[model samples]
Target chain A: SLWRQTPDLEQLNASQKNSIGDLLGIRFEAFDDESLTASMPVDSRTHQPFGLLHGGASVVLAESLGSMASYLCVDTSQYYCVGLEVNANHLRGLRSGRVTAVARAIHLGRTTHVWDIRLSGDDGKPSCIARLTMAVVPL
Target chain B: SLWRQTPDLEQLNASQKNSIGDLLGIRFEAFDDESLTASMPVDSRTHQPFGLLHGGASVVLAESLGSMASYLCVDTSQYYCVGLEVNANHLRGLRSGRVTAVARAIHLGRTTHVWDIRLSGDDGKPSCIARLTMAVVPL
Candidate 1:
């Protein structure tokens, strides 16, 4: 297992209520040993001028999921994970409903962790794919 | 010059007033012959769990600037731009105030455009550097 123990998913979502994650309607959905999942509504709060899910919104979901996953993988009292880099590919387009993303760790080192995140629409088809790199810093 | 004619900046910003851009308090501050500038607030709506500017927020600012720059460089009547990929390096930590970003063209090609964007804190010193790639698709 890449995680210590399953965290309180609801409480984790609550913490971001004041963050842009909440403003963008992001919510932590589920997780397991190998992946973390989250979702964002594709309404005006997360839409592009073209009336579709904004590419930036997808990246936000991916980054948050990956960072949170990294956070859970380590002991917070000793280290905190910070985002170092991220990349995304806008694969499909969606105009309504909600979008979800699942993050899986690709590489985990003593100092860094890389994640592969796939974001999909309500139809469960990927609309965006992303990779995130996180730096583990001593507290 | 990489543009046709300087478009109405206010109108362009107003167009995204209904998008997630507006929800995040993003504003197109200014633009010139070679770069586009914008800023975002580092308040409750933008902070991470650690009470600092969220990394995802900076990526959003960078992607928007680069994609918009690509739009201005193309003929919207026949083409439109979509964010294909983006990379960001979070260099410095910011606790309060606002942050600004400048997007400059790096490569203008037939199928894609690459942009170099630098994000800075109120002190006008860079806190993050980003690169964005946009695909120019036929309308």
Candidate 2:
């Protein structure tokens, strides 16, 4: 991770934002060139029978933020990104708290991108962490 | 992997085999009391665009096999076998050849069971490998 220059926040294109929204239902907001935040509310649909957030939902959050952070590195028209491998460790379960995922680039190379994505609960506690490696296919 | 016993092979009832076969579209064959084999042939539905076997299909095969293996530990009345998590690594790809998946027990604890499953191509070479963890529940 952290293998290249940070992206310019102001330069993110519309399709990039729309792709993120369509895929993960998160609000994309950039804080700086190197940091970005995406937030989504946890609901009953995302909860397991025990009322904790489903592990798959956490992966969705992690992958979405990671993809958005990596997308800034390639031409949106000629390159499409999909997750190659992702590993997440869940640390807590929230019943009614909001979760925010923050994604930061770890490596942005010619063919592959890796990101460190973390999800935090509304109480400002870390809930889940993930490392995502995405493969970029040039159109 | 490879941490559990194979003694449960002798106890599979006919209904269990029938259900597993119906779920996966493959017949099960026991090599002995503890080991079993299952297979799915190459078909358009199971192939990717390039005619290679899809990775997720390999996971389906492994999960189905492990699920049947987990069923062995619980009583016939329990009907407790669903995959909790699975980790698979694709070492090779098959284009036109049939694949065989062999499953063996790794851990047969009271509440959870693990299986080390391997898939091989028609060439008798490993195409995909998986470690599956399953939780036992009572019906």
Candidate 3:
């Protein structure tokens, strides 16, 4: 239901989405032009032996949010965007709660757009914070 | 025997290493000019659901490398460094291999140091490729 009737990730020209899909086996949804949200359930398969969420899962979430935000800014044709850099600070730990990530653009430029993405636990305490910088390239 | 003397990270100025340690729960080990290495073990606590490595684990690996590399160029006594931006492209996955990240400086200036850090599996095939940029600040 969160997905669009016609989801058009191709509009953004990011190939990494497919790779990410393979990694997490999760689909991403866009809420609006300014935000993209993805929710992932905490499963034992995604946890460390100690039952904590894996750090890589957090990257998949963070990268998905950041890339989706950048993808929104691309033109229908002639433009593509790739991640230039991503900086994430893990604030708290998550084990049993579903984590939701929301990415919001801080700076949208002709060549780059910066998004500040946040991931929170079901209780709403922040578990991770990140800054993503994306580079716009011509297709 | 893989730990190699527990690394002399404790001898470095506590203030700088402490901030970096806050992220990884490990100390920072300084290398010769513009280079540094940081290591953390595979524990029950940090694994992914697939029982392989979590991708966000790579981010921590990358950040620790970038932060320590930046610390090498700035005033150890008066300046602190934080990641301005960082991104990792995961090339391989390790389900049960130990990792050691080695970071080398590509760009070091008064305000920033760009680093190229590689995370390798115990067998030493490239597990992750990361580029990190750090902003320098006066402590």
Candidate 4:
């Protein structure tokens, strides 16, 4: 298990109540020892002018999961997590239907954490793959 | 001047109406031959739980500008641009006020374009530095 404990999925989702996550309809759905998972709707709010899933929306989902996963592993009493860098490659064009993102750790160091995230639609093929690095900071 | 023509900033902004750009308060404000500029408000909608500007929001801005810049440089009637990969580094923490993003080209290839984008606060210090590569596709 890479997490300190079982993630509080509800609280994690609630934290984004008034954020871009909420505006884009992103939801943190589940987590296991190895990865964290989330879902987002492919609606008007998250689509490009051409009606395809906005690449930026996929980046948002990847960062959200990776950032929360880093927060989970750190000692909250003294530290917090912020993004250092993120890279996302949009693999396929998706027009509608929801997509899922699964983030798994690539590295968990004292000062930084890296995650590999895959975003896929109902067809179960990756539409986007992303990596995020979080910088651990003192609160 | 790297543009195909003077970019129609008004039309660009209008195209994003009812999309994430409108939702997050992102606006295409200016452009020159060498670069494109936009701004996004740092507010409740764009903030992380700790009140700092969200990294994902910065990525959104970076991708938005880079994508549009490519669109302006291409033969839009035949070639549209889509994100291939994007990487952003959060350089500073910002709490309030609007931040501006400036995107300049790194490479403008036949089938792909790369841009270097800098996101800065009112202080003129970059809060995020990003690079975006876009694929030029045939209609």
Checking candidate 3 for backbone clashes, the offending pairs are A45-B49, A45-B50, A46-B49, A47-B49, A48-B47, A55-B56, A56-B54, A56-B55, A56-B56, A86-B86
Per-prediction backbone clash count: 0, 4, 10, 0
Alpha-carbon error at A40 in model 2, in Å? 2.0
Stretches off by above 4 angstroms in model 3 are: A1-18, B1-116, B119-139
Indicate the residue-level lDDT of B114 in model 4.
Answer: 95
After superposition, the stretches of candidate 1 with alpha carbons farther than 4 Å from their true spots are none
Q: Candidate 1 has what TM-score? A: 0.96
lDDT for each residue of candidate 3 in B1-139, tens digit (9 for 90 to 100): 1221233465542433323233234345456533567654443233333244545556755665565455545766888766555677666657664667888767777787778998887787987788877777786
Which model is ahead, 1 or 3, in terms of TM-score?
1
- lDDT per prediction? 0.86, 0.61, 0.60, 0.89
TM-scores, chain B, all models: 0.95, 0.80, 0.76, 0.97
Model 4 chain A worst lDDT window (10 residues): A16-25
Rank by DockQ, highest first.
4, 1, 3, 2
For model 2, residues B1-139, the per-residue Cα lDDT tens digits are 1323443433432333323233224445555556667786655435432355545456556666676666545765755554566556657768765789999888788787878998898899988777877777676
TM-score for candidate 4, please give it.
0.97
Q: What is candidate 1's local distance difference test score?
A: 0.86
Poorest 10 consecutive residues of model 3 chain B by lDDT? B15-24
Identify the candidate with maximal TM-score: 4
